[PDB]
Design a protein around this ligand. Structure first.
Ligand SMILES: CN1CN([C@@H]2O[C@H](COP(=O)(O)OP(=O)(O)OP(=O)(O)O)[C@@H](O)[C@H]2O)c2nc(N)[nH]c(=O)c21
Length: 163
């Protein structure tokens, strides 16, 4: 896999997956027909303003370690990764109906619907993601739902490091 999503390039460095189509419902009772990936995979994400290592399994973000130019740039990468992971809690974070369209009046695919939704506002996504205690070693630091750094706690699986 060498591809892109949410304006970041992803390069799979280990693992693999089967796509398996599932219909998932949002709190607004919308069906999203989503090609759910199955298996355990690691990627390097590279954007112009942030890079990250993403480890994930089936509908689960195991770890993301992000290096970004600044706080906005780190958030952007975290949102893309939270959507990419296909997590239940990201789907449950959706508020209202998703009807985004491309500059040619076609519906964005469902993964892009989710992404465009959270790029507009990520408060509910980050608030419902989950918090964990962290070891704070090797220069990894945590990031809280309001993007404040913490050496004690972080959004689950999310670390920030410039090393
Ligand atoms: C969640 N994803 C998404 N993804 C890939 O990310 C790329 C961008 O997704 P997209 O443009 O929404 O999908 P599209 O091109 O319509 O294909 P698809 O319908 O397979 O998502 C696709 O190549 C898709 O396979 C993935 N690739 C791997 N290896 N593992 C994964 O978990 C995922």
């Amino acid at each position: 896999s060498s591809f892109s999503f949410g304006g970041f390039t992803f390069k799979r460095t280990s693992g693999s997956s089967i796509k398996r189509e599932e219909e998932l419902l949002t709190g607004n009772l919308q069906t999203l027909k989503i090609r759910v990936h199955e298996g355990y995979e690691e990627f390097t994400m590279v954007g112009k303003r942030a890079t990250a290592i993403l480890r994930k399994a089936t509908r689960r973000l195991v770890q993301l370690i992000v290096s970004g130019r600044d706080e906005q740039s780190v958030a952007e990468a975290i949102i893309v990764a939270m959507v990419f992971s296909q997590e239940d809690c990201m789907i449950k974070a959706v508020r209202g109906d998703l009807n985004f369209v491309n500059r040619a009046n076609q519906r964005l695919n469902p993964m892009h619907q989710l992404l465009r939704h959270f790029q507009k506002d990520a408060k509910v996504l980050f608030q419902n993601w989950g918090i964990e205690h962290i070891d704070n070693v090797m220069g990894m630091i945590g990031v809280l739902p309001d993007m404040t750094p913490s050496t004690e706690m972080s959004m689950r699986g999310i670390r920030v490091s410039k090393m």
